Design a protein around this ligand. Sequence first.
Ligand SMILES: C[C@@H](O)[C@H](NC(=O)c1ccc(C#Cc2ccccc2)cc1)C(=O)NO
Ligand SMILES: [Zn+2]
Length: 300
Amino acid sequence: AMIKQRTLKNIIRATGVGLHSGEKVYLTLKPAPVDTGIVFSRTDLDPVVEIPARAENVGETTMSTTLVKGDVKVDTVEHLLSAMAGLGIDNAYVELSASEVPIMDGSAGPFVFLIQSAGLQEQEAAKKFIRIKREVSVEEGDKRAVFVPFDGFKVSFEIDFDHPVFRGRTQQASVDFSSTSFVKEVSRARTFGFMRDIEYLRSQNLALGGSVENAIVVDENRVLNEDGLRYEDEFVKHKILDAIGDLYLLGNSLIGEFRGFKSGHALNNQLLRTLIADKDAWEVVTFEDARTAPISYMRP
Ligand SMILES: C[C@@H](O)[C@H](NC(=O)c1ccc(C#Cc2ccccc2)cc1)C(=O)NO
Ligand SMILES: [Zn+2]
């Protein structure tokens, strides 16, 4: 059995608010033909502006990952793309009635549930993977992001906060998707912010849609959310979720390993751009026989 490209079986809709804009937004996920990739569409505009979710269309990366075409933007794509990558969706149209993707509960959980509710459709074309053949790294100050050849898909991440809440083994995590489920162990990890940083963002008219219902708020000594964390290491697992979404801007599932040290959307995008430019470090591969493949996907 060939590892096939996947799309959605049915259209599905969601309503929410943009984390940074605070704007109400309607999201529609639609099936798409083979080799379309993930394509965002601003349906509030006339004509409709389509922006493929590709590294070349990445705009500002100071807070969230943004896609740009001309002066048309699609903000905060990373959690939705993380859900797409996690469920192996190759092709889909993502329609939005506003510039920013809804934040939902701040994780990829509501998206993974909406996608699986609609169901997946295997398509009549081989799924294309980007296989890391050589190591590629990028650094900036003490931040680092690396691609390493690896027979499968693995993400390691380490955060470094000199803070009472961020001590012990909860500051690093590695997820090997051959034995670990993206859905159970990464997808529910919510976005987070430190109270002083969030205050700064609010003073700059950013984080307008943020609340304890869609973000973990940390002050100088504790988690302010009354109901607590979903994972003991929720923060570093959210950084893993971000990296998976940002890596999906390559346009294809990866066969390799990512390692991040204090990395964020900007350095993740720099890593993709360096990888793409270094064509000796990667190749496109397919699996006409699923038994020889190092990556496996759930039933559609
Ligand atoms: C973890 C970070 O890398 C980032 N998240 C943020 O930058 C961020 C920004 C603002 C808020 C917020 C908020 C808020 C506003 C008012 C009241 C309570 C929370 C949360 C996370 C992120 O998840 N990018 O995808
Ligand atoms: Zn995030």
